[PDB]
């Protein structure tokens with residue numbers, strides 16, 4: 001054990017938004033979706049936060065590219081708010097819901113239902129999910145590479161703990177605006193430049209009407 005290699009990918013507007021204030025996220029073009037799916041096809045797991053599941057109900061599977069098998073889907077959900085009918089819980093792939101060790105009668109029942117549906121539930125942390133410990137658990141399961149799709153709040157959590165290895169960002173040629181709109185990285189935020197995350201621009205190229213930037217995280 002140690003922890004998986006983590007790639008953070010996202011599609012954002014020039015002003016760093018992941019969606020409008022009304023959750024409209026038609027940012028990535030077709031070319032970018034193909035690129036993303038190729039990445040999905042090459043990792044052991046895809047990780048996303050409950051916030052994204054609630055707002056977008058994604059499948060998190062390889063569907064617009066030749067697919068053999070799908071990577072494990074991981075959802076960070078502290079209070080187990082994942083809707084019982086969320087697509088991320090369908091049978092297209094294996095799914096793991098990472099929640100906290102906190103408990104109540106209703107939560108335990110929900111866990112039983114999820115397990116009955118073939119969904120695995122991992123308890124890890126108090127108050128909020130302990131990402132570092134979760135990485136150990138996922139590594140022991142054989143998941144050595146994970147595509148982190150976010151969104152904003154989870155990304156903060158991952159970057160704060162320095163668990164991200166590399167970053168790929170697709171920047172769309174548009175501007176959304178909005179102090180309330182979700183950005184690539186939200187959460188608390190670093191107080192000074194000294195403690196912020198450092199990166200190294202490794203590669204970049206246009207894709208469709210936008211551009212892709214690839215960075216390596218300087219740990």
Ligand SMILES: NC(=O)c1ccc[n+]([C@@H]2O[C@H](COP(=O)([O-])OP(=O)(O)OC[C@H]3O[C@@H](n4cnc5c(N)ncnc54)[C@H](OP(=O)(O)O)[C@@H]3O)[C@@H](O)[C@H]2O)c1
Pocket residue numbers: 009010011012018019023025027048049050051052053055056076077078079127128129130131149150151152153154155156157158182186
């Ligand atoms: N354009 C893209 O590529 C892209 C990709 C992904 C998402 N998005 C967008 O991002 C938007 C906003 O997402 P969001 O920020 O509200 O949700 P999020 O970033 O996916 O985070 C969801 C939840 O994870 C939970 N969590 C549990 N433990 C955590 C920890 N240790 N660190 C951080 N989070 C933890 C938090 O709630 P609890 O404590 O209740 O569990 C948090 O609200 C979504 O609406 C979606 O449209 C865009």
Ligand SMILES: OC[C@H]1O[C@H](O[C@H]2[C@H](O)[C@@H](O)[C@H](OCCC3CCCCC3)O[C@@H]2CO)[C@H](O)[C@@H](O)[C@@H]1O
Pocket residue numbers: 104105106109
């Ligand atoms: O564990 C999940 C369930 O939680 C509640 O069940 C109550 C249930 O409705 C309620 O009747 C029960 O208390 C029963 C009455 C007490 C009175 C004091 C002596 C012991 C028996 O307490 C349960 C919780 O411990 C909710 O009422 C249920 O809807 C929910 O499914």
